[PDB]
């Protein structure tokens, strides 16, 4: 979510010539090859445990 300076209506990327033309009054920042980065690191499934027979006697 990158907002518009001037109306503030949220990010829309047109895939023509790499701009950010919003649904309102055009403020297309034609970002050059600056590489977009959004790595939202997730979770990693973490191994397992054997659910042992150490305790069941009580």
């Amino acid at each position: 979510l990158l907002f518009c300076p001037g109306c503030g209506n949220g990010l829309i990327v047109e895939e023509g010539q790499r701009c950010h033309r919003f649904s309102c009054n055009t403020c297309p920042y034609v970002h050059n090859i600056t590489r977009k980065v959004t790595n939202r690191k997730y979770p990693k499934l973490k191994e397992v445990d054997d659910v042992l027979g150490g305790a069941a006697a009580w």
Binding site: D49, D50, V51, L52
Partner: protein, 58 residues
């Protein structure tokens, strides 16, 4: 056949047994709580800490 409060009063041997068991049972549970939050506590295979702590409290 009759019941009374003499049939419920602990003798001398219970009180010195319960007093140590309430102390030595509370020293470890004070440490098992302290081994969790202050530092590193090993985990039972069921869940993480603060879940196997209670199963080791019980």
């Amino acid at each position: 056949f009759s019941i009374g409060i003499g049939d419920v009063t602990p003798g001398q041997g219970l009180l010195k047994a319960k007093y140590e068991l309430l102390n030595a049972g509370y020293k470890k549970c004070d440490e098992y709580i302290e081994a969790l939050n202050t530092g590193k506590l090993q985990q039972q295979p069921g869940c993480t800490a603060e879940e196997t702590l209670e199963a080791l409290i019980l």
